[PDB]
TrEMBL record:
This is Uncharacterized protein. The lineage of its organism: Bacteria, Bacillati, Actinomycetota, Actinomycetes, Kitasatosporales.
Length: 159
DNA sequence: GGATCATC
DNA sequence: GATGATCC
């Protein structure tokens, strides 16, 4: 029930498709997850209007874009939607992929979908502390291997 | 709107 | 071959 929902979450995170720079993975997705991991910790709303998130995640990409991350939260949240971790509804029709640039801006600017982390994962990280460490340590090892994470970890309530 | 690369 | 993204 709860433990199965836990290892479900990790399985999806371990099997994430992320782009990789010359020296490591692009941090678009972990910046997104840790932003939602922190919000789930403080019990904050689950879903948010895209402009409110586009700013929030985009702000963190501006501050901690260690691999030239530009403030484009639409790339990770589409990969995470395909990964089963993100809920997108409000839009009409079908959700695009994260291959391109213009269409990613146009789709989000036109539909303006309300998005958040998946309902069972958000509530799980709220109540379960065992899962917050297993999701942070997993993301920190695979994505931030060699980098200073504590500035980002601070700016999301995850110190 | 596109060429292009790396990863899946 | 489809998907996460750089770059024009």
């Amino acid at each position: 029930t709860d433990t199965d929902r836990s290892e479900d979450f990790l399985r999806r995170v371990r099997g994430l498709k992320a782009a990789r720079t010359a020296n490591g993975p692009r941090l678009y997705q972990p910046i997104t997850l840790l932003w939602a991991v922190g919000r789930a910790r403080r019990g904050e709303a689950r879903t948010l209007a895209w402009a409110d998130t586009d700013e929030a995640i985009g702000a963190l990409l501006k501050r901690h874009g260690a691999r030239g991350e530009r403030p484009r939260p639409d790339y990770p949240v589409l990969a995470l939607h395909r990964a089963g971790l993100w809920t997108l509804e409000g839009h009409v029709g079908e959700v695009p992929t994260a291959h391109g640039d213009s269409a990613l801006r146009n789709w989000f600017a036109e539909q303006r979908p309300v998005g958040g982390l998946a309902e069972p994962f958000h509530d799980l990280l709220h109540r379960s502390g065992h899962s917050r460490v297993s999701v942070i340590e997993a993301l920190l090892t695979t994505y931030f291997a060699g980098l200073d994470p504590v500035p980002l970890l601070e700016d999301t309530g995850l110190y």
